[PDB]
Amino acid sequence: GSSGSSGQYCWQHRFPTGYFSICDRYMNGTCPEGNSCKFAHGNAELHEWEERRDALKMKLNKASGPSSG
């Protein structure tokens, strides 16, 4: 209604350490890590993560190196 109908998004969660998957522990019920976890904590959360990280690439690039062990 007010403050913009569509111009209002509420997505504030942890940052995706860098992984793009769901946390089995969290999905099961409880997770050991918690906030400093590398996995996602809820289908919804993941969605946001994919973005949060997609923001870094704004300046970062893929071509970095082989890093073959």
Residues forming the site for Zn ion (CB under 5 A): 23, 25-26, 31, 33, 37, 39
Q: State in angstroms the smallest separation of the CB of 39 from Zn ion.
A: 5
Nearer to Zn ion, 13 or 37 (CB): 37
Q: How far apart are CA 59 and CA 33, in angstroms?
A: 29
33 vs 57: CA distance, rounded Å? 26
* Side chain identity, residue 10: C
Nearer to Zn ion, 3 or 38 (CB): 38
CB of 43 vs Zn ion, minimal distance in Å: 14
39 versus 49: smaller Cβ distance to Zn ion = 39
Residue 39 burial (C-beta neighbours within 10 Å; 0-12, 13-18, 19+): buried
